[PDB]
Amino acid sequence: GEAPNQALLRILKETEFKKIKVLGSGAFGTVYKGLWIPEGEKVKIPVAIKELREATSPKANKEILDEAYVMASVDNPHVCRLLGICLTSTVQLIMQLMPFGCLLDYVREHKDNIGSQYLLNWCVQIAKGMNYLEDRRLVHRDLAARNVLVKTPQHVKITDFGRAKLLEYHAEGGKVPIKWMALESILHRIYTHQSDVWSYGVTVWELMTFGSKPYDGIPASEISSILEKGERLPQPPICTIDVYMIMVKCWMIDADSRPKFRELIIEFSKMARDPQRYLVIQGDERMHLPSPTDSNFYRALDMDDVVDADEYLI
Numbered sequence: 001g002e003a004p005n006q007a008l009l010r011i012l013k014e015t016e017f018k019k020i021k022v023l024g025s026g027a028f029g030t031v032y033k034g035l036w037i038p039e040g041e042k043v044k045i046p047v048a049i050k051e052l053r054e055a056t057s058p059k060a061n062k063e064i065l066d067e068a069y070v071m072a073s074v075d076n077p078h079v080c081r082l083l084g085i086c087l088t089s090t091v092q093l094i095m096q097l098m099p100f101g102c103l104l105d106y107v108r109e110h111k112d113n114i115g116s117q118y119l120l121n122w123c124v125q126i127a128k129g130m131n132y133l134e135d136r137r138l139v140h141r142d143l144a145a146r147n148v149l150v151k152t153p154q155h156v157k158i159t160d161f162g163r164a165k166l167l168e169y170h171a172e173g174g175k176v177p178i179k180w181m182a183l184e185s186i187l188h189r190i191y192t193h194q195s196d197v198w199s200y201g202v203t204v205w206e207l208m209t210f211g212s213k214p215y216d217g218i219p220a221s222e223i224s225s226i227l228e229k230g231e232r233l234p235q236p237p238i239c240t241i242d243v244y245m246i247m248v249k250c251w252m253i254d255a256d257s258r259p260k261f262r263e264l265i266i267e268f269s270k271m272a273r274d275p276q277r278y279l280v281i282q283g284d285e286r287m288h289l290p291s292p293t294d295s296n297f298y299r300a301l302d303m304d305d306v307v308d309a310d311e312y313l314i
């Protein structure tokens with residue numbers, strides 16, 4: 001009927017990994033930067049250790065274990081990998097460290113060095129990961145530039161599967177990101193891969209504007225009515241009509257009319273072959289971002305036996 005999920009859930013010993021510092025904290029919990037040193041493997045894997053705040057309750061453990069399930073069931077270069085879980089009183093998710101943080105902060109902090117090549121390459125990469133989730137019958141339900149994290153300035157991955165559901169999905173109440181949601185999702189609680197396309201459209205808009213807040217100043221309760229009238233996000237200044245047309249197509253009333261992720265990969269790839277024809281940025285091509293071919297690129301985070309999780313297969 002539905003294929004058995006043969007994913008392996010790795011249980012990791014608390015003694016095998018070490019917390020270095022807090023990267024962030026909030027509603028999600030507390031995310032720590034760490035190092036995982038397996039068995040007698042002679043390797044040190046940079047990791048992100050996630051735990052829900054501090055307070056241990058059966059409800060909090062269920063949500064984090066559901067997230068572990070979804071994450072252990074995915075394997076794509078553009079989707080964050082779950083290395084394992086630690087069965088402490090609290091319960092920790094051990095995922096691959098994305099050293100440069102989220103894309104939203106990245107574009108905000110580095111706008112003066114982000115060229116059109118990087119921007120269109122990010123769009124291709126996000127569509128590839130999103131298309132993988134689609135193949136795996138998975139609806140993200142929370143795609144935004146805050147949930148697209150940076151491994152290297154040239155390699156981004158989809159993260160935060162707290163809302164992700166394995167297959168239209170029928171949800172309930174709570175806290176919803178309205179300004180990233182499709183109309184059917186706001187009015188009828190309907191989530192499809194095509195509602196993820198709407199979220200992709202807003203994510204692209206976030207990148208193209210260099211981290212602008214969508215519908216800034218407008219209260220979330222007004223959004224539903226604004227979209228119903230025909231109002232959308234403006235054309236970012238760096239955007240040509242070619243790129244904005246793509247964004248607009250992601251924001252159509254008819255879900256079947258919106259592009260498919262496999263088409264978005266194609267469209268953005270064509271554009272990424274000639275970035276200056278699709279994005280007009282002052283100073284483009286003279287811009288510089290760190291790459292693994294830079295001095296102290298890896299030293300900027302002991303070493304010697306440090307291996308990235310993408311190169312640590314088991």
Ligand SMILES: Cn1nccc1S(=O)(=O)Nc1ccn2ncc(C(=O)NC(C)(C)C)c2n1
Nearest residue numbers: 023024028031048095096097098147159160
């Ligand atoms: C909650 N959230 N938001 C974006 C990502 C996440 S996450 O589910 O904690 N996933 C992951 C995975 C790897 N890495 N590496 C670094 C981070 C990180 O800086 N996270 C915060 C602090 C939440 C922005 C990370 N976060």
